[PDB]
């Protein structure tokens, strides 16, 4: 009651896919791209690429890709008021795909409170369940700004941590039950602590490089070149 054989789990994981970030070096850093059945968290300072990465993935998730990836739809929950379809128009132009089809295949919602965010995630779970295999990517930009907002004074920290853990376990279960990649953005002070560190399967620090370049790094990894990748930002997105 509650156990699978290793064979059944292997068969389930054989369906795992990667979504290209638009950057070859970033993809190599990630082992192919943003991985399904997992949460990938991106954090960094202002103008490091989080929003550009979110939008690029919003476009690249719809394209057939390596490893038999067929493409699919995306759900975007926006707590920062930063989502801009016109960026998706420019990235679609770069990738030579129709604007209106791209815009029709992305479902979008603003979250104004942490309770609202969790209700939205319950609706997302319902939508995914309506017909599996349609949606491949869930983006949350950002993952816990609203938890900082709704529990800013200490003494309510216990409830904040409990709600955060509950939300992140729900996100994990959503990603693993329906074989979708979950990509979330996060702020730095990274916030959340042990809960978010454990919940995320991949953590990416974004920082500014030389000129207009950006650098992605595996968080908490040794200071070694293989754990880092250089990429560029253009009107066409991440490259």
């Amino acid at each position: 009651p509650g156990f699978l054989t290793a064979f059944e789990y292997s068969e389930k994981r054989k369906m795992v896919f990667h979504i290209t970030t638009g950057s070859q070096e970033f993809d190599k850093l990630l082992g192919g791209g943003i991985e399904s059945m997992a949460i990938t968290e991106a954090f960094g300072e202002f103008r490091t690429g989080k929003t550009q990465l979110s939008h690029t993935l919003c476009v690249t998730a719809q394209l057939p890709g390596a490893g038999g990836y067929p493409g699919g739809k995306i759900i975007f929950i926006d707590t920062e008021n930063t989502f801009r379809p016109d960026r998706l128009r420019d990235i679609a132009d770069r990738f030579n795909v129709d604007h209106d089809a791209v815009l029709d295949n992305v479902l979008y919602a603003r979250a104004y409170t942490s309770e609202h965010q969790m209700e939205l995630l319950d609706y997302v779970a319902a939508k995914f369940h309506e017909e599996a295999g349609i949606f491949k990517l869930l983006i949350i930009d950002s993952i816990m700004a609203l938890f900082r907002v709704d529990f800013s004074g200490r003494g309510e920290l216990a409830e904040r941590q409990q709600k955060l853990a509950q939300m992140l376990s729900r996100l994990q279960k959503i990603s693993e039950e329906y074989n979708v990649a979950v990509f979330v953005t996060n702020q730095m002070t990274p916030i959340g602590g042990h809960i978010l560190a454990h919940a995320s399967t991949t953590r990416i620090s974004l920082r500014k490089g030389r000129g207009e370049l950006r650098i992605a790094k595996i968080y908490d990894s040794p200071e070694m070149p293989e754990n880092e990748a250089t990429f560029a930002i253009t009107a066409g997105g991440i490259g």
Binding site: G71, N96, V97
Partner: peptide, 9 residues
Amino acid sequence: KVFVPPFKT
């Protein structure tokens, strides 16, 4: 039901 990738060139 299968997803149709966008393509116009």
